mmCIF file of C-alpha atoms and ligand atoms in Angstrom:
data_model
loop_
_atom_site.group_PDB
_atom_site.id
_atom_site.type_symbol
_atom_site.label_atom_id
_atom_site.label_comp_id
_atom_site.label_asym_id
_atom_site.label_seq_id
_atom_site.Cartn_x
_atom_site.Cartn_y
_atom_site.Cartn_z
ATOM 1 C CA UNK A 1 -10.876 -31.575 7.291
ATOM 2 C CA UNK A 2 -9.207 -32.801 10.487
ATOM 3 C CA UNK A 3 -7.817 -36.317 10.217
ATOM 4 C CA UNK A 4 -8.792 -38.126 13.444
ATOM 5 C CA UNK A 5 -5.209 -38.940 14.405
ATOM 6 C CA UNK A 6 -3.680 -35.468 14.856
ATOM 7 C CA UNK A 7 -3.793 -33.619 18.174
ATOM 8 C CA UNK A 8 -2.977 -29.919 17.732
ATOM 9 C CA UNK A 9 -3.089 -27.280 15.005
ATOM 10 C CA UNK A 10 -0.729 -24.423 14.147
ATOM 11 C CA UNK A 11 -1.043 -22.368 10.966
ATOM 12 C CA UNK A 12 2.155 -20.323 11.334
ATOM 13 C CA UNK A 13 4.140 -18.497 14.029
ATOM 14 C CA UNK A 14 3.701 -21.365 16.527
ATOM 15 C CA UNK A 15 0.059 -20.238 16.618
ATOM 16 C CA UNK A 16 -1.685 -23.235 18.181
ATOM 17 C CA UNK A 17 -4.822 -22.706 16.079
ATOM 18 C CA UNK A 18 -6.486 -26.010 16.939
ATOM 19 C CA UNK A 19 -8.154 -26.443 20.340
ATOM 20 C CA UNK A 20 -10.172 -29.616 20.875
ATOM 21 C CA UNK A 21 -12.042 -31.075 23.849
ATOM 22 C CA UNK A 22 -11.474 -34.704 24.915
ATOM 23 C CA UNK A 23 -15.198 -35.487 24.704
ATOM 24 C CA UNK A 24 -15.900 -33.739 21.379
ATOM 25 C CA UNK A 25 -13.597 -33.129 18.411
ATOM 26 C CA UNK A 26 -13.826 -29.603 16.977
ATOM 27 C CA UNK A 27 -11.322 -27.547 14.983
ATOM 28 C CA UNK A 28 -10.811 -23.803 15.348
ATOM 29 C CA UNK A 29 -8.508 -20.992 14.236
ATOM 30 C CA UNK A 30 -6.975 -18.255 16.392
ATOM 31 C CA UNK A 31 -6.051 -14.765 15.189
ATOM 32 C CA UNK A 32 -5.338 -11.489 17.000
ATOM 33 C CA UNK A 33 -8.229 -9.043 17.213
ATOM 34 C CA UNK A 34 -8.746 -6.092 14.862
ATOM 35 C CA UNK A 35 -7.190 -3.437 17.106
ATOM 36 C CA UNK A 36 -6.111 0.037 16.004
ATOM 37 C CA UNK A 37 -3.558 2.758 16.572
ATOM 38 C CA UNK A 38 -4.480 6.395 17.107
ATOM 39 C CA UNK A 39 -3.256 9.801 15.951
ATOM 40 C CA UNK A 40 -4.542 13.258 16.871
ATOM 41 C CA UNK A 41 -5.454 15.812 14.202
ATOM 42 C CA UNK A 42 -5.085 19.163 15.958
ATOM 43 C CA UNK A 43 -5.163 22.618 14.346
ATOM 44 C CA UNK A 44 -3.152 25.414 15.943
ATOM 45 C CA UNK A 45 -3.387 25.358 19.754
ATOM 46 C CA UNK A 46 -3.918 29.135 19.740
ATOM 47 C CA UNK A 47 -6.748 28.666 17.222
ATOM 48 C CA UNK A 48 -9.051 26.148 18.913
ATOM 49 C CA UNK A 49 -9.028 23.157 21.245
ATOM 50 C CA UNK B 1 33.531 5.323 -42.950
ATOM 51 C CA UNK B 2 34.616 8.926 -43.465
ATOM 52 C CA UNK B 3 37.279 11.206 -44.914
ATOM 53 C CA UNK B 4 37.795 14.966 -45.119
ATOM 54 C CA UNK B 5 34.377 15.150 -46.825
ATOM 55 C CA UNK B 6 31.376 12.953 -45.994
ATOM 56 C CA UNK B 7 28.064 12.926 -44.092
ATOM 57 C CA UNK B 8 24.921 10.806 -43.733
ATOM 58 C CA UNK B 9 21.412 12.256 -43.999
ATOM 59 C CA UNK B 10 18.134 10.350 -43.515
ATOM 60 C CA UNK B 11 15.665 10.138 -46.384
ATOM 61 C CA UNK B 12 12.608 8.639 -44.652
ATOM 62 C CA UNK B 13 11.331 8.518 -41.068
ATOM 63 C CA UNK B 14 9.182 6.256 -38.886
ATOM 64 C CA UNK B 15 7.004 7.309 -35.957
ATOM 65 C CA UNK B 16 7.323 4.968 -32.979
ATOM 66 C CA UNK B 17 5.537 4.494 -29.656
ATOM 67 C CA UNK B 18 6.997 2.900 -26.528
ATOM 68 C CA UNK B 19 5.605 2.461 -23.031
ATOM 69 C CA UNK B 20 7.361 3.472 -19.812
ATOM 70 C CA UNK B 21 5.814 2.034 -16.654
ATOM 71 C CA UNK B 22 6.307 3.972 -13.429
ATOM 72 C CA UNK B 23 5.109 3.115 -9.908
ATOM 73 C CA UNK B 24 3.263 6.000 -8.251
ATOM 74 C CA UNK B 25 1.522 4.740 -5.102
ATOM 75 C CA UNK B 26 1.600 1.552 -3.048
ATOM 76 C CA UNK B 27 -1.308 0.103 -1.080
ATOM 77 C CA UNK B 28 -0.551 1.341 2.432
ATOM 78 C CA UNK B 29 -1.297 -0.928 5.378
ATOM 79 C CA UNK B 30 -2.147 0.485 8.809
ATOM 80 C CA UNK B 31 -0.492 -1.830 11.320
ATOM 81 C CA UNK B 32 -0.873 -0.872 14.969
ATOM 82 C CA UNK B 33 1.762 -1.552 17.648
ATOM 83 C CA UNK B 34 0.192 -2.955 20.868
ATOM 84 C CA UNK B 35 -2.054 -5.884 19.715
ATOM 85 C CA UNK B 36 0.661 -7.171 17.318
ATOM 86 C CA UNK B 37 3.418 -6.861 19.979
ATOM 87 C CA UNK B 38 0.914 -7.798 22.751
ATOM 88 C CA UNK B 39 -2.789 -8.726 22.651
ATOM 89 C CA UNK B 40 -5.290 -8.459 25.505
ATOM 90 C CA UNK B 41 -3.352 -9.429 28.634
ATOM 91 C CA UNK B 42 -3.311 -8.149 32.205
ATOM 92 C CA UNK B 43 0.467 -7.603 32.141
ATOM 93 C CA UNK B 44 0.216 -6.098 28.670
ATOM 94 C CA UNK B 45 0.003 -2.470 29.846
ATOM 95 C CA UNK B 46 2.591 -2.779 32.640
ATOM 96 C CA UNK B 47 5.528 -4.545 30.975
ATOM 97 C CA UNK B 48 4.912 -2.614 27.749
ATOM 98 C CA UNK B 49 5.614 0.724 29.453
ATOM 99 C CA UNK B 50 8.910 -0.505 30.942
ATOM 100 C CA UNK B 51 10.582 0.431 27.648
ATOM 101 C CA UNK B 52 8.684 3.720 27.346
ATOM 102 C CA UNK B 53 6.645 5.119 24.452
ATOM 103 C CA UNK B 54 8.722 3.607 21.648
ATOM 104 C CA UNK B 55 5.400 2.949 19.917
ATOM 105 C CA UNK B 56 5.298 6.741 19.530
ATOM 106 C CA UNK B 57 8.342 6.498 17.248
ATOM 107 C CA UNK B 58 6.744 3.419 15.631
ATOM 108 C CA UNK B 59 3.163 4.248 14.622
ATOM 109 C CA UNK B 60 3.759 7.986 14.135
ATOM 110 C CA UNK B 61 5.751 7.457 10.936
ATOM 111 C CA UNK B 62 3.517 4.722 9.496
ATOM 112 C CA UNK B 63 0.648 7.167 8.977
ATOM 113 C CA UNK B 64 3.040 9.551 7.235
ATOM 114 C CA UNK B 65 3.811 6.828 4.702
ATOM 115 C CA UNK B 66 0.082 6.443 4.069
ATOM 116 C CA UNK B 67 -0.576 10.160 3.554
ATOM 117 C CA UNK B 68 2.391 10.537 1.205
ATOM 118 C CA UNK B 69 0.915 7.709 -0.882
ATOM 119 C CA UNK B 70 -1.999 9.840 -2.096
ATOM 120 C CA UNK B 71 0.087 13.004 -2.416
ATOM 121 C CA UNK B 72 2.026 10.975 -4.994
ATOM 122 C CA UNK B 73 -1.149 10.223 -6.976
ATOM 123 C CA UNK B 74 -2.433 13.802 -6.588
ATOM 124 C CA UNK B 75 0.523 15.620 -8.162
ATOM 125 C CA UNK B 76 0.889 12.975 -10.888
ATOM 126 C CA UNK B 77 -2.579 12.894 -12.448
ATOM 127 C CA UNK B 78 -4.182 16.069 -11.081
ATOM 128 C CA UNK B 79 -1.796 18.315 -13.050
ATOM 129 C CA UNK B 80 -4.423 20.115 -15.148
ATOM 130 C CA UNK B 81 -6.865 22.187 -13.107
ATOM 131 C CA UNK B 82 -9.878 21.887 -15.451
ATOM 132 C CA UNK B 83 -11.356 18.598 -16.670
ATOM 133 C CA UNK B 84 -11.700 18.655 -20.458
ATOM 134 C CA UNK B 85 -13.541 16.381 -22.886
ATOM 135 C CA UNK B 86 -12.961 15.404 -26.506
ATOM 136 C CA UNK B 87 -15.407 16.560 -29.187
ATOM 137 C CA UNK B 88 -18.274 14.163 -29.934
ATOM 138 C CA UNK B 89 -17.127 13.709 -33.554
ATOM 139 C CA UNK B 90 -13.743 11.978 -33.840
ATOM 140 C CA UNK B 91 -12.075 13.761 -36.782
ATOM 141 C CA UNK B 92 -8.378 14.491 -36.203
ATOM 142 C CA UNK B 93 -7.153 14.630 -39.789
ATOM 143 C CA UNK B 94 -6.594 10.873 -40.073
ATOM 144 C CA UNK B 95 -5.196 9.954 -36.657
ATOM 145 C CA UNK B 96 -7.122 7.294 -34.721
ATOM 146 C CA UNK B 97 -7.270 7.660 -30.914
ATOM 147 C CA UNK B 98 -9.863 4.943 -30.262
ATOM 148 C CA UNK B 99 -7.146 2.938 -28.473
HETATM 149 C C1 LIG C 1 -0.916 31.820 18.252
HETATM 150 O O1 LIG C 1 -1.866 32.741 18.796
HETATM 151 C C2 LIG C 1 -1.300 33.655 19.746
HETATM 152 C C3 LIG C 1 -2.442 34.476 20.297
HETATM 153 O O2 LIG C 1 -2.505 34.393 21.714
HETATM 154 C C4 LIG C 1 -0.226 34.503 19.071
HETATM 155 O O3 LIG C 1 0.377 35.355 20.038
HETATM 156 C C5 LIG C 1 0.830 33.608 18.435
HETATM 157 O O4 LIG C 1 1.754 34.397 17.693
HETATM 158 C C6 LIG C 1 0.176 32.587 17.508
HETATM 159 N N1 LIG C 1 1.172 31.682 16.961
HETATM 160 C C7 LIG C 1 1.162 31.263 15.690
HETATM 161 C C8 LIG C 1 2.267 30.331 15.297
HETATM 162 O O5 LIG C 1 0.297 31.620 14.896
HETATM 163 C C1 LIG C 2 10.123 5.829 -46.877
HETATM 164 O O1 LIG C 2 11.164 4.890 -46.655
HETATM 165 C C2 LIG C 2 11.411 4.060 -47.797
HETATM 166 C C3 LIG C 2 12.415 3.015 -47.369
HETATM 167 O O2 LIG C 2 11.995 2.358 -46.182
HETATM 168 C C4 LIG C 2 11.894 4.922 -48.960
HETATM 169 O O3 LIG C 2 12.082 4.098 -50.106
HETATM 170 C C5 LIG C 2 10.876 6.014 -49.262
HETATM 171 O O4 LIG C 2 11.402 6.904 -50.240
HETATM 172 C C6 LIG C 2 10.527 6.791 -47.994
HETATM 173 N N1 LIG C 2 9.469 7.753 -48.256
HETATM 174 C C7 LIG C 2 9.576 8.731 -49.160
HETATM 175 C C8 LIG C 2 8.387 9.633 -49.297
HETATM 176 O O5 LIG C 2 10.586 8.879 -49.840
#
Protein backbone atom coordinates (compact mmCIF):
# COMPACT_ATOMS: atom_id res chain seq x y z
CA UNK A 1 0.00 0.00 0.00
CA UNK A 2 1.61 3.23 -1.20
CA UNK A 3 0.62 6.27 0.83
CA UNK A 4 -0.10 9.07 -1.67
CA UNK A 5 2.49 11.43 -0.21
CA UNK A 6 5.75 9.52 -0.77
CA UNK A 7 7.76 9.84 -3.97
CA UNK A 8 10.32 7.02 -4.29
CA UNK A 9 10.83 3.48 -3.03
CA UNK A 10 13.96 1.61 -1.92
CA UNK A 11 13.84 -1.79 -0.24
CA UNK A 12 17.55 -2.08 0.61
CA UNK A 13 20.95 -1.37 -0.94
CA UNK A 14 19.82 2.04 -2.27
CA UNK A 15 17.70 -0.02 -4.68
CA UNK A 16 15.19 2.54 -5.95
CA UNK A 17 12.41 -0.06 -6.20
CA UNK A 18 9.57 2.39 -6.78
CA UNK A 19 9.15 3.98 -10.22
CA UNK A 20 6.00 6.04 -10.79
CA UNK A 21 4.71 8.13 -13.69
CA UNK A 22 3.46 11.69 -13.12
CA UNK A 23 0.11 10.92 -14.76
CA UNK A 24 -0.52 7.55 -13.08
CA UNK A 25 0.63 6.26 -9.69
CA UNK A 26 1.97 2.69 -9.76
CA UNK A 27 4.39 0.88 -7.45
CA UNK A 28 6.99 -1.64 -8.59
CA UNK A 29 9.97 -3.63 -7.30
CA UNK A 30 13.36 -4.06 -8.97
CA UNK A 31 15.64 -7.08 -8.57
CA UNK A 32 18.60 -8.39 -10.58
CA UNK A 33 17.83 -11.15 -13.07
CA UNK A 34 18.33 -14.87 -12.42
CA UNK A 35 21.73 -15.18 -14.11
CA UNK A 36 24.14 -18.09 -13.71
CA UNK A 37 27.80 -19.01 -13.57
CA UNK A 38 29.30 -21.85 -15.59
CA UNK A 39 31.77 -24.68 -15.04
CA UNK A 40 33.02 -27.29 -17.51
CA UNK A 41 32.90 -31.01 -16.70
CA UNK A 42 35.62 -32.52 -18.88
CA UNK A 43 36.98 -36.08 -18.71
CA UNK A 44 40.59 -36.70 -19.69
CA UNK A 45 41.61 -34.68 -22.77
CA UNK A 46 43.31 -37.78 -24.19
CA UNK A 47 40.08 -39.74 -23.64
CA UNK A 48 37.46 -37.67 -25.47
CA UNK A 49 36.55 -34.10 -26.37
CA UNK B 1 38.41 -40.43 52.41
CA UNK B 2 41.09 -43.12 52.32
CA UNK B 3 43.94 -44.76 54.23
CA UNK B 4 46.37 -47.59 53.54
CA UNK B 5 43.32 -49.81 52.93
CA UNK B 6 40.06 -48.69 51.30
CA UNK B 7 38.13 -48.77 48.01
CA UNK B 8 34.66 -48.01 46.64
CA UNK B 9 32.71 -50.46 44.48
CA UNK B 10 29.29 -49.84 42.88
CA UNK B 11 26.36 -52.06 43.82
CA UNK B 12 23.75 -51.01 41.24
CA UNK B 13 23.86 -49.42 37.79
CA UNK B 14 21.65 -47.23 35.59
CA UNK B 15 21.52 -47.20 31.79
CA UNK B 16 21.41 -43.69 30.35
CA UNK B 17 20.85 -42.14 26.92
CA UNK B 18 22.08 -38.73 25.77
CA UNK B 19 21.89 -36.98 22.41
CA UNK B 20 24.84 -35.44 20.57
CA UNK B 21 23.86 -33.15 17.69
CA UNK B 22 26.36 -32.75 14.86
CA UNK B 23 26.10 -30.60 11.72
CA UNK B 24 26.84 -32.56 8.54
CA UNK B 25 25.82 -30.48 5.51
CA UNK B 26 24.75 -26.89 4.92
CA UNK B 27 22.35 -25.70 2.22
CA UNK B 28 24.75 -24.51 -0.47
CA UNK B 29 23.86 -21.43 -2.49
CA UNK B 30 25.11 -20.96 -6.06
CA UNK B 31 25.88 -17.26 -6.41
CA UNK B 32 27.30 -16.16 -9.75
CA UNK B 33 29.79 -13.30 -10.18
CA UNK B 34 28.84 -11.02 -13.13
CA UNK B 35 25.12 -10.14 -12.58
CA UNK B 36 25.70 -9.52 -8.84
CA UNK B 37 28.83 -7.39 -9.49
CA UNK B 38 27.29 -6.03 -12.74
CA UNK B 39 23.91 -6.62 -14.42
CA UNK B 40 23.07 -6.14 -18.10
CA UNK B 41 25.01 -3.05 -19.18
CA UNK B 42 26.91 -2.10 -22.32
CA UNK B 43 30.08 -1.28 -20.36
CA UNK B 44 29.61 -4.39 -18.25
CA UNK B 45 31.86 -6.63 -20.38
CA UNK B 46 34.56 -4.01 -21.04
CA UNK B 47 35.28 -2.55 -17.59
CA UNK B 48 34.85 -5.98 -16.00
CA UNK B 49 37.81 -7.40 -17.95
CA UNK B 50 40.11 -4.53 -16.93
CA UNK B 51 40.85 -6.46 -13.73
CA UNK B 52 41.15 -9.80 -15.53
CA UNK B 53 39.45 -13.13 -14.81
CA UNK B 54 39.28 -12.77 -11.03
CA UNK B 55 35.82 -14.32 -11.31
CA UNK B 56 37.74 -17.49 -12.21
CA UNK B 57 39.20 -17.50 -8.68
CA UNK B 58 35.73 -16.53 -7.37
CA UNK B 59 33.14 -18.93 -8.81
CA UNK B 60 35.53 -21.88 -9.23
CA UNK B 61 35.73 -22.51 -5.48
CA UNK B 62 32.03 -21.94 -4.76
CA UNK B 63 31.04 -25.07 -6.67
CA UNK B 64 33.64 -27.04 -4.72
CA UNK B 65 31.89 -26.04 -1.50
CA UNK B 66 28.62 -27.35 -2.94
CA UNK B 67 30.03 -30.72 -4.02
CA UNK B 68 31.76 -31.27 -0.67
CA UNK B 69 28.37 -30.71 1.00
CA UNK B 70 26.95 -33.99 -0.30
CA UNK B 71 30.21 -35.90 0.14
CA UNK B 72 29.73 -35.06 3.83
CA UNK B 73 26.25 -36.63 3.85
CA UNK B 74 27.40 -39.62 1.76
CA UNK B 75 30.16 -40.86 4.07
CA UNK B 76 28.09 -40.16 7.19
CA UNK B 77 24.89 -42.12 6.52
CA UNK B 78 25.88 -44.37 3.62
CA UNK B 79 28.33 -46.36 5.79
CA UNK B 80 26.66 -49.77 5.44
CA UNK B 81 26.61 -51.10 1.88
CA UNK B 82 23.39 -53.15 2.14
CA UNK B 83 20.03 -51.77 3.27
CA UNK B 84 18.58 -53.97 6.01
CA UNK B 85 15.12 -54.14 7.58
CA UNK B 86 13.85 -55.14 11.01
CA UNK B 87 11.77 -58.30 11.41
CA UNK B 88 8.00 -57.83 11.14
CA UNK B 89 7.45 -59.04 14.73
CA UNK B 90 8.97 -56.71 17.33
CA UNK B 91 10.30 -59.10 20.00
CA UNK B 92 13.72 -58.10 21.36
CA UNK B 93 13.58 -59.72 24.79
CA UNK B 94 11.81 -56.78 26.45
CA UNK B 95 13.46 -53.76 24.84
CA UNK B 96 11.12 -51.32 23.07
CA UNK B 97 12.44 -49.61 19.91
CA UNK B 98 9.15 -48.04 18.80
CA UNK B 99 10.67 -44.61 19.50
C1 LIG C 1 46.63 -39.64 -22.19
O1 LIG C 1 46.60 -40.38 -23.42
C2 LIG C 1 47.85 -40.38 -24.12
C3 LIG C 1 47.61 -41.10 -25.43
O2 LIG C 1 47.97 -40.30 -26.54
C4 LIG C 1 48.93 -41.03 -23.26
O3 LIG C 1 50.17 -40.96 -23.94
C5 LIG C 1 49.03 -40.33 -21.92
O4 LIG C 1 49.93 -41.02 -21.07
C6 LIG C 1 47.66 -40.26 -21.24
N1 LIG C 1 47.73 -39.52 -20.00
C7 LIG C 1 47.08 -39.88 -18.89
C8 LIG C 1 47.28 -39.00 -17.69
O5 LIG C 1 46.37 -40.88 -18.85
C1 LIG D 1 19.56 -50.88 42.46
O1 LIG D 1 19.90 -49.68 43.14
C2 LIG D 1 19.26 -49.57 44.42
C3 LIG D 1 19.58 -48.20 44.95
O2 LIG D 1 19.27 -47.19 43.99
C4 LIG D 1 19.74 -50.70 45.33
O3 LIG D 1 19.05 -50.62 46.57
C5 LIG D 1 19.47 -52.05 44.68
O4 LIG D 1 20.06 -53.08 45.46
C6 LIG D 1 20.05 -52.09 43.26
N1 LIG D 1 19.70 -53.33 42.59
C7 LIG D 1 20.03 -54.53 43.06
C8 LIG D 1 19.59 -55.71 42.24
O5 LIG D 1 20.67 -54.67 44.10
